[PDB]
Each structure stands twice: as C-alpha cells, then as structure tokens.
Paper text:
In this pursuit, we report the crystal structure of the target, HMG-CoA reductase in the apo form (Ref-apo), and in complex with the ligands HMG-CoA, mevalonate and the cofactor NADP+ (Ref-ternary), from the pathogenic bacteria E. faecalis. The crystal structures of the apo and the ligand bound enzymes were solved to 2.25 Å and 2.27 Å respectively. The resulting structures follow the overall architecture of the previously published bacterial homologs. Although the asymmetric unit of both the crystal forms (Ref-apo and Ref-ternary) consists of a tetramer arranged as dimer of dimers (AB and CD), the dimer-dimer interface is not conserved. In the apoenzyme structure, the dimer–dimer contact is primarily mediated by a calcium ion donated by calcium acetate in the crystallization condition. Since the dimer-dimer interface is quite small and not conserved across different forms, it is likely a consequence of crystal packing and has no biological relevance. Though otherwise a classic Class II HMGR, its entire N-terminal domain (residues 1-65) undergoes a complete domain swap around the hinge region (residues 42-45) and interacts with the main domain of its dimer partner and in doing so resembles the Class I homologs. All the three efHMGR structures reported here suggest that Gln-57, Ser-59 (in the ENQIS loop) and Glu-60 (residue X) make several interactions, which stabilizes this crossover. In the apoenzyme, Glu-370, the last residue of the hinge is partially disordered.
In this study, we report the crystal structures of HMGR from Enterococcus faecalis (efHMGR) in the apo and liganded forms, highlighting several unique features of this enzyme. HMG-CoA reductase (HMGR) catalyzes the four-electron reduction of (S)-HMG-CoA to (R)-mevalonate, which is the rate-limiting step of the mevalonate pathway. Briefly, efHMGR is an obligate, intertwined dimer with the two active sites composed from components from each of the monomers. For example, Asn-184 (A) means that the residue Asn-184 originates from chain/monomer A. Each monomer consists of three domains: a large domain (residues 1-108 and 212-370) that binds HMG-CoA in an extended conformation, a small domain (residues 109-211), comprised of a non-classical Rossmann nucleotide-binding domain that interacts with NADP+/NADPH, and finally a C-terminal flap domain (residues 371-423) that comprises the last 53 residues of the monomer.
Numbering used by the authors:
A (entry chain A): 11 to 370
B (entry chain B): 13 to 372
The structure:
C-alpha cells in the first residue's frame, strides 16, 4: 500500500502471499506468464501478472475483393464460428464511404459573449494552424496535422473549439493533446479575459466513420429453399432492433463481439472503440442498431456504419509481441484498411447472429 | 480442415502457406494459458492475447477494503484508480437491483393490445413452464420473477422476462425459459408468429448506484482544493451538454470498469453495451456520473447497469480469473457489481481532477 508501486513484481506477489491476500496456487498462477515481465511491468502500474484471452482466426472474410485472415481474441464460444459463417454467406463486403480524422476540443467556460469569441477565432484560423504545426511538427512531416477547425456553443457559458486532425496510422492521443495544449497557450495570450476549462482529445471519432455493405442472393441464406423467408425475418429482426432499445443493445453487443475481438487482438484500445461505437448508435435521440438490412428484389442488402479510430502503430500495437503477430496474420497496410476490415467483421457477425436468431 | 486442425497444425499451415513468418509462429507459440483450455473455449484457436494485469489500491466500499485486479494495456489507468480511491477514502452504496432481462417478440400482430390481453391471463402457466425449462435456478432461490408487455409499431409485441439468475450472467437460464415458453406460445396462438426469443443485454434491473463524499481539501496538495472541486463540477456538467465530451468522460470510467471486468473473466462487450446505452437520458448521450459541490465537500455519484458474474462463462475456466477472484475476494455477484461501480467513480474522479488541474 505504501511501497507497492516501487516493489518489483516478484516482491508484490510475495507480499500478497505473506499478507494472506492470495493463496499459493494463486501466486503460482500469477507467475505463469508469457508476456515478458519487463514489458508488462513498464506498461502499467502495480503490475503482478497478465490476463490471457484465447485468440483464434476468423475465416472467409472478403473486403473489396481482398481475402483476409482475421485475428480474434475472445473468451466467448461461437463468436469466431459465427463470424466465419456470416462471412462465408456474405461472400464479400464493399466499402461505401470512409473518413479518418481524429477529434479534439478546447473548451471555454464563463464566456459572456459566446458568438463574439468564435468570431474572434474564425478570422485567425491561419495562425491557429501555424501554432498547431509548431506544437507537433512530426505529424506534419509525416503528412498529417490539423485539417479543420469548428466552433460550437453551449448553455451560453461554454465554447468548444473543435479540432479535426489527421493522425495518420496512430490513434492520436499524444498528437492531438500536445497540439491542443500548445494551441491553448496561444489562446490565452490572445484572450487573457477568457478562461479555458480543459484541452483534450475526444474519443467520439465521428470523422473516422466507415460504412460497409454486402449484397447477398437470398439463395445463399439457407441450404434449403427457405432463403427468402429467412431474409424477410432478418429484415424484421434488424428493423425491430431500431424500435426497441432492449433489442438494440443486444443487437449491437453481438456486433461488438466481433469488432472488439479484432480490436483486442491487434493491441488497440477496446474502451475507445466501444465508447465511440455505442455513442454513434444514438441516432434521432434514441439508441438504435448500428446496422441496417433491407430486401431489394432477390438480394438481401446489409450495411454498417461505425466510428473506428483504430491504429496500426503506437499504443499497444507494437510493444506487445502478440499484437505484431496478429498484425502479421491480418496483413493490413494502414489504419484505414484496418477500420474497413473491422467494420466488415461487425456486419458479418450481425448477419450470422440474425440468421441463427430467426431461423426457428 | 482448418477448423478440424489442432492448434499446432494451424500454425504450421499458416507458415507453410506463407501467411505468417517463422518469427510470428514462434510468438504465437509463446503461451501461458493451457492449450487444452484455450482450444476448447473458442474455434480456430491458434494462440492468446496477453493483457498486463495490475492491482488497484486504496479502494474502500461500504467500509470494506479491496485489492482490485485490473487488466489493461493503457499506462496510468491503474495508478489513476489507486490515486482516485485514495482521495475518495470510501464509497457508499445508494441502491442496487439484480435481475436479468429476456424477451419473446411477436411480429405481424394484427392487434397487439389484444394479444397482450390473452397473454396476461395465462401467466401462471408461463411461470410454471419457465420452471420446467430450467428447474435448477428455482431450487437455488431464483427464477422468473416478473412479466411485462410492450407493443411496438402496431405490429410487434415484446413479452419481457425479469429473471433472478443469482451469481451467473444468466444467458443459459434465461434462454432456456424463453425457448420453453415460446413453444407454449406456438401451441396457444397458432395464428401468431414469433420473431425471436433471446436474452437481452440491457440489464436495466441490474443497476447499481454508488456515491462518495470528499472534503475539498483532499483534492489538492496546496490550498486551491475547493477551486479544483468547482472545476470538477463544471467538467462533469459539461459532459451532460456536449456528447463529444460525454463519450470521453464515459470512456475514462470504462478504463476502470472494463479492467476489472476483464480481469475477472466477465463479458466485456455486455458491460460496455449496457453501460453506454444507459448513458442515454432525455434522448441525449450524457455522462454516467454526476458531481456537485455541497458546502466544503465534493459529492460524486455513479449509476450503471452491471449484470456481472462470479460463476459461469469464463469466471472459473480461465485460471487467471480464479486468481483475480482470490485477490478481490468478493462473496457474490451483487458485491462484485458494487465494487466495480465504485471503481468506475474513483477512475472518473482521478480523470476529472487531472483534466482541470492542467488548465490552471
Ligand atoms: Ca472550419
Ligand atoms: Ca502475413
Ligand atoms: Ca492492403
Ligand atoms: Ca391489458
Ligand atoms: Ca484472497
């Protein structure tokens, strides 16, 4: 409690055993680790062991005519089998649209004249962009950096300056934070009368949304001759999810079984993706499903749209050897392609869940 | 054939086919979870993901001290939880419920309110069938407790099941009853059609409310502890106005909650989906905590649906889950949910205190 944060992992475990907080078999199991103790102990604080999540391979996924082998880390049975089944039925997925910009905000408070403050800033945008480069030049040399500023006001007392930043293949926490912390020091020289509450990245990556679709002949749905009937019930089930939040949450949870499994296997931040995806499910003031299914002629059409600010470098994507091994199997080129594969996984998982759900 | 292969044949096939390098194969083979367990929990298993697990410190809930196992790949999370709990000193339970939710959904219903009327006069037979489908839970003092009915779109009827599943998450119990009762509905109403009968992950009857009261002097090592308290109340209030902050505000909460959920072998997707959906109040995605200033004491409160488990799923089959359970030493799932919700509030306190102290 006092020296635990300075203790070595071996001293921590011995301390817990000696104080009776763990048994001898518990200590032996905590010591049964495959991630290097020097890596683990430097990644987090008070480190003592690791959690092991089985990792399997999702099969038959094809996105934009390209085959993939999807690494999926999950503790839940049938998740990988369902992804492989839905992907085989869909045959292929196609990209509809995609953007990739990370969001940040500098928030003012006790603003007497909100509309006038944003007008002061809108004319000096060229100098805000220049201060952004100075606060983080590396990303600008890599070909990214601030791409757009936006302005919003709330409760007649808050003013949010939004930053849309190209963070390239990283998630962008350090880029955006440092960039906005420097641009905030400039905001304070310009307007000493105004006050800043905080300057931080936003995980609601509405400018990293990917939209994927699939078009399935109803014949492919069932090996029998009931495919059209199964398609109609899939459309109804998907429609019902956007009517009843108690189904929407389960509907989207099923999607995240696949999405989070790839996110985890590749060393990405699972809380960030879950937060942004579930928040994005809130449309028209209501929590709805993240996918849509419609019947057009003899073809079942599915579509998904999710904010996926994923990373192929930084964070835990490289420091953890298993992240790199998973990336070798997946063989994506950049983060944009990762988001496309992950979105297609979500839609494939949704197809398998719905088909199994309504086939009675 | 990949599905039928052993884990070793799979890795050999991936290398021989040119999909992974020899270095990657060797890293996939560096595993600590027994191959027999991993290969039986999931499909197409090849390896595992290792997430560093540490110990959150200084957490006190209802005058009981805990050592919190936390599995995360993000630095500073475990340290921030320990610090937030240290400042908090203690956490008190406000209210708690623990019932799991299921639903049988009819479609193409000519008169939803008329079908509901016919159902409400057969509840004794439904309850009787629910027990016959899964008698074990009834003997251990649980089982179906309530039935509710909702109509949607003038064509759907949802029969809602509220079930006491004791220390399990409850998928097998709930789905067993729903299947049995659904077959009864098909005999009773041959003209009606059932779309699906499945567990719902939106556990609104498993919500836990936790609170804390901190003298403002504890927020700062200096003398502006009441200032930092005022700015924490502003940052929290702002989350209830701007969704781009509410997602980040709640993401920070889940850094703690998901870390414990993962360490204890619980379903991370289920908790994430239910918590983020529960954040939608008044048609707006808002924060899951509230912070207010009452004199010289900062008051924090959290309210989250936590249908967590101490048995079933992966809470025991994964040896690290049992080890984590030993460290935390919780008697039942209800207690687990109280501890995890307190972890969420402490993590939020540490994040908000740091967010505003930077702006000063
Ligand atoms: Ca602009
Ligand atoms: Ca490869
Ligand atoms: Ca590529
Ligand atoms: Ca009635
Ligand atoms: Ca113990």
């Amino acid at each position: 409690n006092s020296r635990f944060y300075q203790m070595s992992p071996e001293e921590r475990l011995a301390s817990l055993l000696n104080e009776g907080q763990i048994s001898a078999d518990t200590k032996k199991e905590f010591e049964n680790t495959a991630l290097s103790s020097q890596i683990a102990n430097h990644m987090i604080e008070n480190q003592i062991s690791e959690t092991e999540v089985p990792m399997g391979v999702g099969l038959h996924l094809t996105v934009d005519e390209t085959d993939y082998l999807v690494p999926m880390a999950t503790e839940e049975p049938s998740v990988i089998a369902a992804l492989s089944n839905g992907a085989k039925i869909a045959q292929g997925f196609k990209t509809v649209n995609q953007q990739r910009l990370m969001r940040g905000q500098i928030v003012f408070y006790d603003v007497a004249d909100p509309e006038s403050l944003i007008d002061k800033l809108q004319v000096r945008e060229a100098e805000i962009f220049q201060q952004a480069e100075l606060s983080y030049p590396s990303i600008v040399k890599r070909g990214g950096g601030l791409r757009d500023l936006q302005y919003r006001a709330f409760d007649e007392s808050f003013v949010s300056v939004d930053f849309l930043v190209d963070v390239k293949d990283a998630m962008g926490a350090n880029i955006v934070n440092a960039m906005l912390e420097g641009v905030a020091e400039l905001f304070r020289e310009w307007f000493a009368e105004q006050k800043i509450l905080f300057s931080i990245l936003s995980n609601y990556a509405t400018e990293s949304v990917v939209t994927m679709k699939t078009a399935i002949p109803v014949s492919r749905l069932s090996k029998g001759s009931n495919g059209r009937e199964i398609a109609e019930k899939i459309v109804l089930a998907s429609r019902y999810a956007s009517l009843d939040p108690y189904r929407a949450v389960t509907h989207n949870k099923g999607i995240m079984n696949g999405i989070e499994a790839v996110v985890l296997a590749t060393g990405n931040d699972t809380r960030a993706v879950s937060a942004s995806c579930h928040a994005f499910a809130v449309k028209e003031g209501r929590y709805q499903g993240l996918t849509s299914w419609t019947l057009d002629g003899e073809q079942l059409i599915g579509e998904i749209s999710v904010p996926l600010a994923l990373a192929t470098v930084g964070g835990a994507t490289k420091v953890l050897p298993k992240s790199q091994a998973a990336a070798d199997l997946l063989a994506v080129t950049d983060a944009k392609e990762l988001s496309r594969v992950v979105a297609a996984v979500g839609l494939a998982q949704n197809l398998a869940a719905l088909r199994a759900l309504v086939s009675e």
